[PDB]
Design a protein around this ligand. Sequence first.
Ligand SMILES: Nc1ncnc2c1ncn2[C@@H]1O[C@H](COP(=O)(O)OP(=O)(O)NP(=O)(O)O)[C@@H](O)[C@H]1O
Ligand SMILES: Nc1ncnc2c1ncn2[C@@H]1O[C@H](COP(=O)(O)OP(=O)(O)NP(=O)(O)O)[C@@H](O)[C@H]1O
Ligand SMILES: [Mg+2]
Ligand SMILES: [Mg+2]
Lengths: 483, 482, 49, 468
Amino acid sequence: ANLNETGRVLAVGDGIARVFGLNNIQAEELVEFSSGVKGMALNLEPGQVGIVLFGSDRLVKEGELVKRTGNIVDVPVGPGLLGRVVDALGNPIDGKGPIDAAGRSRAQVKAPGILPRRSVHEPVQTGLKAVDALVPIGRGQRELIIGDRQTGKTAVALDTILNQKRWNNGSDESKKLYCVYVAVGQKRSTVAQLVQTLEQHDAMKYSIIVAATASEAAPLQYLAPFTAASIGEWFRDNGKHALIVYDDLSKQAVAYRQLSLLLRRPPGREAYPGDVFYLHSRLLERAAKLSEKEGSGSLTALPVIETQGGDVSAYIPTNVISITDGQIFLEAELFYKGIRPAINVGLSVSRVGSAAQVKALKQVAGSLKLFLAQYREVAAFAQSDLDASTKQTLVRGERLTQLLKQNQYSPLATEEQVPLIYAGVNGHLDGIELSRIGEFESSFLSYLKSNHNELLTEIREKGELSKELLASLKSATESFVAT
Amino acid sequence: NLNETGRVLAVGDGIARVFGLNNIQAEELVEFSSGVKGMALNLEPGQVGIVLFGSDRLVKEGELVKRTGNIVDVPVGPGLLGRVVDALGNPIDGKGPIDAAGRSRAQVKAPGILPRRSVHEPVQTGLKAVDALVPIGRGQRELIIGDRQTGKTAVALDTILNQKRWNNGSDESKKLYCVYVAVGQKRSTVAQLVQTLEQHDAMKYSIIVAATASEAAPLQYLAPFTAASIGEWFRDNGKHALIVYDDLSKQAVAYRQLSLLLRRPPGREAYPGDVFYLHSRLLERAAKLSEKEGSGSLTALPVIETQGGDVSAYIPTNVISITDGQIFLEAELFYKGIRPAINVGLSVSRVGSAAQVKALKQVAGSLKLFLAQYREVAAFAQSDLDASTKQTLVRGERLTQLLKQNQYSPLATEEQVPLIYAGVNGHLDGIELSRIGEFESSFLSYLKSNHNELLTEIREKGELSKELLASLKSATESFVAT
Amino acid sequence: AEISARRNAMDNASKNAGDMINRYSILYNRTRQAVITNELVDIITGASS
Amino acid sequence: PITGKVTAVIGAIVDVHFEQSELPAILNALEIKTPQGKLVLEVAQHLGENTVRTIAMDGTEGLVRGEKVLDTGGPISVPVGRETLGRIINVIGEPIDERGPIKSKLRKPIHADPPSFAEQSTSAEILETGIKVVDLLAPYARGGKIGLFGGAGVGKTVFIQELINNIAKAHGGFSVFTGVGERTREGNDLYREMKETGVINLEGESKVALVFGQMNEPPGARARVALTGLTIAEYFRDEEGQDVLLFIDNIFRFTQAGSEVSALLGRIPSAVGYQPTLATDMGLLQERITTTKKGSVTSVQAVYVPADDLTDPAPATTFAHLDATTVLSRGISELGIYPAVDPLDSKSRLLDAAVVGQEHYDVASKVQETLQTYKSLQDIIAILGMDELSEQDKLTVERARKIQRFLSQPFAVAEVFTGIPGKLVRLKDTVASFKAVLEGKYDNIPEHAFYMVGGIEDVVAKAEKLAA
Ligand SMILES: Nc1ncnc2c1ncn2[C@@H]1O[C@H](COP(=O)(O)OP(=O)(O)NP(=O)(O)O)[C@@H](O)[C@H]1O
Ligand SMILES: Nc1ncnc2c1ncn2[C@@H]1O[C@H](COP(=O)(O)OP(=O)(O)NP(=O)(O)O)[C@@H](O)[C@H]1O
Ligand SMILES: [Mg+2]
Ligand SMILES: [Mg+2]
């Protein structure tokens, strides 16, 4: 009788269920069905409530009794979550007991606006030469990773999650960045091994993983990044720093195309609903840097787009690039030639980190960006004549790209990168063989680690460079060129 | 009443919606007050969705409709040979009633995994290019494909015309009955295709199921299944038919018309989901049945019409992925004068080797080899070529020339193997390229008078002795010297 | 000396048109693909009404 | 016994009515009895007013409105266990080989739950196949998925049979071959060829269960067969804790079929006309094919590529699950090399130093590298001869031939066809054999010794025949 906490299924199909009654229900509120399957109240019409199933349709029957939750779609949040692995409803799935919560954030929270915000300025050290030097990422910035399948998109992201161990270890409360790995549309097998390798590097203790694998329900795979968003949001709110990774948004978008087409909304470009932008925009807008008045918490979106035959111009990628604060376009043609991480320079850009990067490196990498980005169009006009003007500048761009080459699971510290860029743009290494470039990288750090120890220590204390440390290192460089 | 009868609620565009007929079976044929027939395809809660076989000017709202309690069937059996029927089995040639050995439903299960043997007997088409390079087996499904006006029908028709060799003989297992399913063709075309087989005394063993341009879509949809069941009669009865579907493109177009009008939901190019299932059902019915089943057989020549050569086009995709290969036609090759205009590089028969007069396969394992390498050094036809790639261009031109063949003149196997022998083993390299025309004519008539015995052995033994190879060799070297 | 040059030049032409072919091949498949989707939509919308 | 009535018939879509809250759940098997046997209907939706919408598993000609429909009270279920080996089965778990009913001890729903995040394998692991090319260059995931490429003329079925044999012989696990969108001709061939090769043994024991779902069958049938078979394979991993092979030919036509079902169900097509459901549909399938603590199901899946477009939704979405491709090639068979695996193309995403070990890795890397330099030299040899190579260059070229010859391997299953005694090469052989060749330890040994042999000691014994 009292259809006010309850209703009955009138019809169910294609991941939706039209329930009768539920008169006190509110939009976006959660609902439980006779077999404990959670749905969500999409639209409310006179007569019936459209409800989206967070699961198999099989688990529902026309006729079933449906209960209200009074909760709008929401997750457990707070410190406890770290070192655990949950699904789209913060339900524990590693089997390591119950989720230890601080409270419960909605998966649908609004973005910090114009005023509580503050220009991003602390760097997020990725340990990746090509990244840190060229497209550096500040805390609160939202940097895209956009490549073809099999390009080292996760590699890049994973490696950052690894590198934070330098900081998440020590007493320092402000140098700490916690990691949130959303696993949208991935395999169960892939995630296992991805947790394994995060435990193999200990980084588990300081990271939370939310995963909605390729088997799970469309609205789970859709709701996953959002709920992860709130999980991370807790840190950004309680004056700490968090790094969320959306792997990937392209598979999230695709789940949305699912629901949207089963709810019979018109298809736009590539059969996508007109609101597929708003999906990602309203998500990313949450990764953010706060003002001194609001604790100065920060949350760093590393979404991953995956393109198709290298296509940047596609309708999803454009949308996400027109949302993010730049992108790290990883090109396959380079990666096939053994260049790793295969960052296309003239197609990657950090938009707000070139003022967030560690001083030391910016000093030692004067313009390095468009050097290499206009070095690419030149070497691609040779296969003509001997021109010792641009021929001379070639010996650089090759030793330089040879210099960005980073073997996987190799997080370098800032002080270690700076001397390499030094010798790069100062050309201390041109007389060293092309197949002895990366080999020397190991030889040189062996040379610096027990001699010019303070050079490393002071760049690790300040992060700046006086003209004092310039000549002090311009003796440690040509020294090893002779010895 | 309403269990056996219904009332038209509405009618238009070849479709009529009808109230009642409550006991009707899906795909039951029904009859209207005016006498036009139709079939019931959608059985809906309140109404039945019947497709019309005739002009819907005949039908009005409120009219009475009668069940015929009958799934579409068709008369089948040899009383049909030499007859021209519409898709329901009706006679359209002024020759009185069909004498049916029985009736078979238009729809029938394909012979399963178990009651089939591997294809092993040739369908000899008479076409040098096809028989030699794209060998067809009995029970096979070879697809004829190309743009409009390339020669598709000609290939099929020459297969049909070439069966006189056996159909006029005695031995059953060696005869082959022809079934030409005409879909959405100008009646005057069909008329002329008739007037063409009668001009070659081929009608006597052929059946034309006619679903011409202007007839209700259901009939155009039905005709190939209708004719399919006609073929199976022979298959099921230890005999052999071959069936030409001209064409499947137009059948799919028809199915489309019905569906859209019935407002069944559309996909790619506005075809229903089960357009594949349409054609799979059709062509899976073709087979070589196992000894236990009378070892009969049904071979399939579906025609598919590309548009500007598009094999990715929705329908061609489906069909190509059902068949055991394609004979591929191109107007380019055609205007060059290479007729049949068979693209060799693109034509395959997945059955292949197993279905070839052992003798033709003996002097031609080299032929696909030579013509492959000739396709790769072709652009070298424009001043300073080394003797190796010079030679390759010397065979190729002659060989290609040898596979031109005027229409309607298919060659007997024992007439192919000499020419393909003199070719492959380099007895034409001396001869100029224009004389390869008169070469064939004069060689064969000479071989007939002065070597009729070797020809006879090939025709009879079907293989080539070490002696027969020196016989032919000697007879050739003699004619080439002369 | 000219013949050598002609050889080398023609050689690079083949490499480039080689690389161009690759690009246009990728572009072809995109266009094909969309041609299918945009064509399909026209029908779907016509059909809902 | 729950009963309904047919209220609507539209191609493979039938609508059935019921009585208050008796409606079967979605994904249930509903039966109508026919003059032949039984038509099976799978439930897609509760449309309301006690009505369910179903998709047929066979034809619907002759259905009359208001006909009896029985609820099985479950999903479609198959016989499982040993009793299915050497049997031919269809989508709805029925014998189609006319050798009685399969007398199984259980039956299991074709729809099931992928092994939870708990039951997961923490480490990737190589499955040994015994094939040199494979193990050395494109090693298989244990509980992984391998995209098999190539049409006919490349001994696909022989190679498949080899793996069924070798997974049975070397490891000790069965195989399930599933024919999705089968050409029936090839079903008759396969079935005969298998008996002829004795992987099927009507008299003794089989190593493989056969689940066919041919083209002529309607879209529902063709969608479910993959699961029909998979279910069977999943029994041997959970009940009998084995390392089972599940073959899927062809995973693409499974996709295709799933599209037709979507269109008929009247749902809006996605991009390029595919089912809006395409990703999750694959997921549901693929995510059951995997390693558990009990055992593993590894899958070899034939992959067709529409319009030769690796960016078409279908392959795109499929590659998303593959861990290794095995590409057989016409070029490779023509050079006489058997199996006709392309050594260069067939790539495994499990050939990493950290997971196959260093020695395995380094070898394979250099092997590909050796073959790479050879591949590019093929053309300068054909203009100026091998008089146009430096000391180092001509060394590897005369050697790469021996390597490209040692990759070929005589099969045990092809023994009835060829008569030559076949060899299974244990992976350590494949390592050390190719190791010793790379350093130049078998240079004085001619090239026809390495061709069609077991390990390196079969080159040694064969070259002594070939010597004196
Ligand atoms: N810098 C590197 N050095 C060596 N190997 C690398 C590097 N980056 C990536 N790889 C390897 O290349 C493969 C691709 O890595 P991955 O992180 O999955 O890139 P991806 O673009 O995310 N591929 P996917 O997620 O499957 O579409 C991985 O298996 C790595 O082992
Ligand atoms: N071998 C041949 N030699 C000479 N003429 C031929 C040959 N084959 C076909 N033709 C002629 O070429 C034309 C095309 O042949 P046709 O059998 O109509 O191909 P088609 O695919 O059936 N054309 P259509 O089906 O009407 O769009 C006909 O007018 C024939 O007269
Ligand atoms: Mg990844
Ligand atoms: Mg024609």
